[PDB]
Design a protein around this ligand. Structure first.
Ligand SMILES: Cc1ncc(COP(=O)(O)O)c(CN[C@H](CCC(=O)O)C(=O)O)c1O
Ligand SMILES: Cc1ncc(COP(=O)(O)O)c(CN[C@H](CCC(=O)O)C(=O)O)c1O
Ligand SMILES: [Cl-]
Ligand SMILES: [Cl-]
Ligand SMILES: [Cl-]
Lengths: 394, 394
């Protein structure tokens, strides 16, 4: 993760806000001395990712809530979502008053075309596609499903910035995409997120909705109009500044992940039991994780235990862990919250205790994902590889 | 506003994060060198405000959202709200799927006891009391209404931190209170706010809800439980470091506000035609604004113009402006948004184009408030006073 390359660039960029800038992302022209960090981050996103618009805001979660509202995805709408993703995917749908509809993942670890096909109803408004663990889904097929059924395609790219699919940056392919710059992402703001799109009406909705409907027109904040209601997901200039310094390092970061993942994957490919996640576009993998499969569930359990025992940290058996797989989200299953949620106001909706995702279970029960870190020396990679081989040894 | 005193302490507090701390408000013990800026600002809010609990998060708006959820205020609940407040108040209610119910203000410019009483129904869960423009409501009578009717008392202290009523810090009298530390408030985090409360159950719900239900128990983040669903309103350590430095200056800010307020008011009191906002606890006034009334709307319009023409800046005729009075909120009245808001799932919603708050209109159509700045010199004040005098001269 990006935090591993914290150096003088980050310190300097943030100190500039404090020394010459201002803390608020808008206005204060007179006294911010032309320091617009948020603005600069958004433009650097547009230029690096080759998208028309980027709107930076308070978190990746706030991104998803904002992207959904901005795209016309609201109260009562069905939104297809996978059962392997971070909890925020499902929380944002529920908070919107929308209805999550689980669809199956495939061997890409992301929504399957056929899975999506099978749960499309007429209530369906959107697909919430997640590029999990730094790689991507079968995008041409999913795009075609969304075009044929008239569905909004939202990309959650919060774990895969710098990845691409056929020369298109992840997050730029659907109607709208989201990024996270939380403290453990590829690139960080400490906290922050972005909504990205080539659709200007979506962008306008996004910047307005994340700032109380403020049109952001003119130089008098107080005099601005509010064509819509909204909320507050503004990001500070210090958070943006840190993000600006980090995004300037994204290419180095992706190259290190790619190099490190390759070396480890290459040596693991001589262990016959190991299968690897499917990658539709190998050139476009951001390489944040090496995801591998064992032949059976029991064997997966055993390898997970032995990786840990042999010092191979940063391995995630998502199937049994609490934050990335539906099966261990009883809280979500049973709509637990200290006040009534909007989803409770909808009668005709899934019983969330009774979701079956058999084909996701089949894959995820045998899947372990290893985090690819930036700090690793070649000696440390060699040792990790030896520890992996010892973990598989029999 | 606190931005007026930015100096070395704010620079130093944030540079301490970037040079020796970490960006994320939790965990990372091994590498943050004991810098817990978010933790410290929370503790300091507990000390200064004699409250048991403080939770710091991404904004004042997120504080309102989080406080409602944390106190049991949710979909279908009626929440009584003033027509004079920032838009965020009504936005936060709608987004919870709760039903804002407008009640009349009195000459305190806060909800009137009798206004509140006239609009209670069995569905009322809460009174959303706003301490507008730095001062308070008739808090003993309001608290009595909430006890007799078994209603949650939520305090929006987002514009009145440092204020008090009978020795009790504003935001601590009801069941839950809310602050803001946006860039133009009294005390700033750049962007930030907090939920304060003496009720541990409310606090626990607040810190969980604002971090995807994370329990925050133990040292391993991934091993934590999620008793409830949540969202992300986490605050960066950099935002917290700024608010920490600011919050240590709060006493000075408030002194300077009272002293400056008293100068202008003393002087305006000698203009026979002026009446002042009612202040239930004069020594508990935070003094962010001097608010005064004229006998007619026409005369208020006239004075507004003449004040600006004579260089009496910082004057807000809320009635006629976009961000703080129901009458100019067509967007809210007609529920304008790019996707359906959760309020739309409540089929016997009030019609928000038909709200009648005649007493509020009668006060607000004649009210003007003047922001008390901290930078003002003795001579700028003297010039201001004399300028106000010219404007009233007829
Ligand atoms: C796919 C996806 N969507 C949304 C988010 C939300 O991002 P933010 O934290 O900026 O709101 C994450 C964050 N990924 C989490 C970090 C979880 C945590 O510890 O907070 C992860 O997958 O580990 C994510 O991976
Ligand atoms: C009573 C009240 N509640 C909530 C908020 C929202 O806080 P936050 O901005 O942290 O989400 C404000 C903000 N004070 C506004 C400033 C609005 C702006 O310029 O954005 C005001 O009343 O002017 C407020 O005064
Ligand atoms: Cl992989
Ligand atoms: Cl997990
Ligand atoms: Cl006053």
């Amino acid at each position: 993760p990006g935090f591993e390359l914290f150096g003088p660039e980050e310190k300097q960029e943030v100190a500039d806000v404090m020394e010459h800038g201002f803390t608020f992302r808008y206005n204060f022209d007179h006294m911010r001395n032309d320091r617009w960090k948020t603005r600069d981050m958004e433009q650097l996103l547009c230029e690096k990712m080759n998208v028309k618009h980027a709107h930076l805001l308070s978190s990746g979660t706030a991104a998803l809530q904002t992207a959904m509202m901005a795209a016309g995805i609201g109260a009562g709408d069905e939104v297809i979502v996978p059962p392997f993703t971070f909890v925020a995917s499902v929380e944002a749908i529920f908070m919107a008053g929308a209805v999550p509809i689980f669809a199956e993942i495939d061997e890409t670890l992301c929504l399957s075309p056929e899975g999506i096909e099978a749960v499309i109803t007429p209530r369906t408004k959107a697909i919430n596609l997640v590029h999990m663990c730094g790689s991507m889904a079968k995008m041409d097929e999913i795009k075609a499903i969304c075009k044929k059924h008239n569905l909004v395609l939202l990309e959650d790219a919060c774990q895969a910035i710098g990845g691409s699919y056929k020369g298109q940056a992840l997050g730029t392919i659907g109607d709208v995409g989201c990024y996270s710059f939380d403290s453990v992402k590829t690139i960080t703001c400490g906290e922050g997120g972005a909504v990205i799109t080539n659709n200007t009406e979506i962008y306008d909705n996004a910047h307005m909705f994340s700032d109380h409907g403020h049109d952001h027109i003119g130089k008098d904040r107080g005099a601005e109009s509010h064509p819509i209601m909204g909320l507050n997901f503004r990001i500070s200039e210090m958070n943006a500044a840190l993000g600006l310094a980090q995004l300037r390092k994204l290419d180095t970061i992706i190259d290190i992940q790619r190099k490190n993942k390759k070396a480890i994957k290459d040596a693991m490919a001589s262990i016959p039991e190991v299968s690897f996640r499917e990658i539709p576009d190998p050139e476009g993998d951001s390489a944040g994780f090496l995801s591998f499969m064992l032949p059976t569930e029991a064997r997966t359990q055993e390898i997970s235990k032995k990786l840990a025992a042999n010092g191979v940290d940063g391995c995630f058996y998502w199937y049994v862990n609490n934050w990335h797989y539906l099966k261990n989200w009883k809280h979500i299953q049973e709509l637990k919250a200290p006040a009534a949620l909007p989803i409770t106001l909808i009668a005709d909706r899934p019983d969330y205790t009774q979701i079956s995702v058999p084909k996701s279970d089949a894959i995820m029960s045998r899947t372990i994902s290893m985090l690819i870190k930036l700090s690793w020396t070649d000696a440390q990679i060699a040792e990790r590889i030896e520890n992996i081989k010892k973990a598989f040894a029999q």
